[PDB]
């Protein structure tokens, strides 16, 4: 409750199924949630215009990712449109929600990946979109940014995602990276379009657990780093809540996300989609 009073609606299975199918209540509930957007006057930095894809979608100062190398004392050099996002049970820095890199921020994005020891990147797109919403920041094979060599070792093609196994090298340091390029984000967020997002969430949870204790932040991004990014993260947190508590609180999860980054889950269609995905997961989990 740091920036606004958080709200909550603890859903048991029956109510979850019904809530996902009540668009009138879903919109009433959604549009009561504060957006917690950042006033652009909060950042007064020469050259900042080049670092943001959208003037009104900025990182909340308290949770913004600060680029510590090569000049932590220079505001421009230390800037990236990215925020640390708490995970399930308030665990700090489980994710980093960021905008899709632009031509002027590709090198900054890789500086963040390296600084944060990021083991997984989740990129959310549709086939119809191709890559008109995000600049191709990874190489065809190899590219070097600020002493860090990025090498695409393997490309795994699945029905709803392309998984790239990437190596990051700098001096005597070598690190692995898994880049999940999800291609099944739907135009119409109907319940029949929920299974591929659920599969992606479950695949990423498994990959995250396999990193072992205190997994470094997982980078999630769409274009603005709030809408689809918000859906993916809220879904991942609620899957854990369902397994552990036997309930889902999408409303509280959304409020928690908005406290970390203004605008997380941007549309009511996206909000309803999280409910469709969670309703489906509850049905699948009921069989084990
Ligand atoms: C407990 C740790 N935070 C690791 C973790 C477990 C999990 O089940 C899902 C995630 C993810 F971030 F991907 F959602 C992460």
What CATH number does residue 72 fall under? 3.90.190.10
Resolution (A): 1.7
**Residue 56 Ramachandran class (φ > 0 left, ψ -120 to 50 alpha, else beta):** alpha
- Tally of CB atoms within 10 A around 133: 15
Answer yes or no: are the C-beta atoms of 243 and 285 closer than 8 Å.
yes
Method used to solve the structure: X-ray
Q: Residue written as tokens 């390296």?
A: 114
Give burial (CB, 10 Å; 0-12/13-18/19+) of 241: buried
Q: Is 240 in the pocket of ligand 1 (CB under 6 A)?
A: yes
- Residue-range definition of the domain harbouring residue 51: 1-288
Give burial (CB, 10 Å; 0-12/13-18/19+) of 43: middle
To the nearest 10 degrees (0 to 180), the angle between helices 194-209 and 227-245 is: 70
**What's the full length of the chain, in residues?**
288
**246 CA distance to ligand 1 centroid (A)?**
17
Protein residue with its CA nearest to atom 14 in ligand 1: 236
- Tally of CB atoms within 10 A around 22: 14
Answer yes or no: are the C-beta atoms of 177 and 167 closer than 8 Å.
yes
Integer Cα distance of 47 and 54 in angstroms: 14
Answer yes or no: are the C-beta atoms of 198 and 76 closer than 8 Å.
no
Q: Residue written as tokens 């990276």?
A: 177
Q: Which two tokens stand for residue 58?
A: 């900025």
Structural domain count of the chain: 1
Close Cβ partners of 162 (under 8 Å, ≥ 6 residues apart): 155, 156, 180, 181, 183
**94 CA distance to ligand 1 centroid (A)?**
7
- 222 assigned binding-site residue: yes
β-bridge mates for residue 149, sequence order: 144, 169
Which residues carry out catalysis? 222
Q: Which two tokens stand for residue 8?
A: 């909550």
Integer Cα distance of 158 and 169 in angstroms: 27
Three-state helix/strand/coil letters over the chain: CCCCCCCCCCECHHHHHHHHCCHHHHHHHHCCCCCCCCCHHHCCCCCHHHHCCCCCCCCCHHHECCCCCCCCCCCCCCCCCEEEECCHHHCCCCEEEECCCCCCCHHHHHHHHHHHCCCEEEEECECCCCCCCCCCCCCCCEEEECCEEEEEEEEEECCCEEEEEEEEEECCEEEEEEEEEECECCCCCCHHHHHHHHHHHHHHHHHHHCCCCCCCCEEEECCCCCHHHHHHHHHHHHHHHHHHHCCECHHHHHHHHHHHCCCCCCCHHHHHHHHHHHHHHHHHHCCC
- Backbone phi, then psi, for 121, in 5-degree steps? -120, 130
Q: Which two tokens stand for residue 101?
A: 């890199």
Q: Is 119 in the pocket of ligand 1 (CB under 6 A)?
A: no
**232 CA distance to ligand 1 centroid (A)?**
12
Listing from the earlier edge strand, what are the strands of the sheet with 173-182?
Answer: 82-85, 95-98, 218-221, 120-124, 173-182, 161-170, 148-157, 142-145
Give burial (CB, 10 Å; 0-12/13-18/19+) of 152: middle
């Amino acid at each position: 409750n740091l920036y606004f009073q958080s709200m909550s609606r603890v859903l048991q299975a029956e109510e979850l199924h019904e809530k996902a199918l009540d668009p009138f209540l879903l919109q009433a509930e959604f549009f009561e949630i504060p957006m917690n957007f950042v006033d652009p006057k909060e950042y007064d930095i020469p050259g900042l215009v080049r670092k943001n894809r959208y003037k009104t979608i900025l990182p909340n100062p308290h949770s913004r990712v600060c680029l510590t190398s090569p000049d932590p004392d220079d505001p421009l050099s230390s800037y990236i449109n990215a925020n640390y996002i708490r995970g399930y049970g308030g665990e700090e820095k489980v994710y980093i929600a960021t905008q899709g890199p632009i031509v002027s921020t590709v090198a900054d994005f890789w500086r963040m990946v390296w600084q944060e020891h990021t083991p997984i990147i989740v990129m959310i797109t549709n086939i119809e979109e191709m890559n008109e919403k995000c600049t191709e920041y990874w190489p065809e094979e190899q590219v070097a940014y600020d002493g860090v060599e990025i090498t695409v070792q393997k490309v795994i093609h699945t029905e709803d995602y392309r998984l790239r196994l990437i190596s990051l090298k700098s001096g005597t340091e070598e690190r692995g990276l898994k880049h999940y390029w999800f291609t099944s984000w739907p135009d119409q967020k109907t319940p029949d379009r929920a299974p591929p997002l659920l599969h992606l969430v479950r695949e990423v949870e498994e990959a995250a657990q396999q990193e072992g204790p205190h997994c470094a932040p997982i980078i999630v991004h769409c274009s603005a780093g709030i809408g689809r990014t918000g859906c993916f993260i809220a879904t991942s947190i609620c899957c854990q809540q369902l397994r552990q508590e036997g309930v889902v609180d999408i409303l509280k999860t959304t409020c928690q996300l908005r406290q970390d980054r203004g605008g997380m889950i941007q549309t009511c269609e996206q909000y309803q989609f999280v409910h469709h995905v969670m309703s489906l997961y509850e049905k699948q989990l009921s069989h084990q």
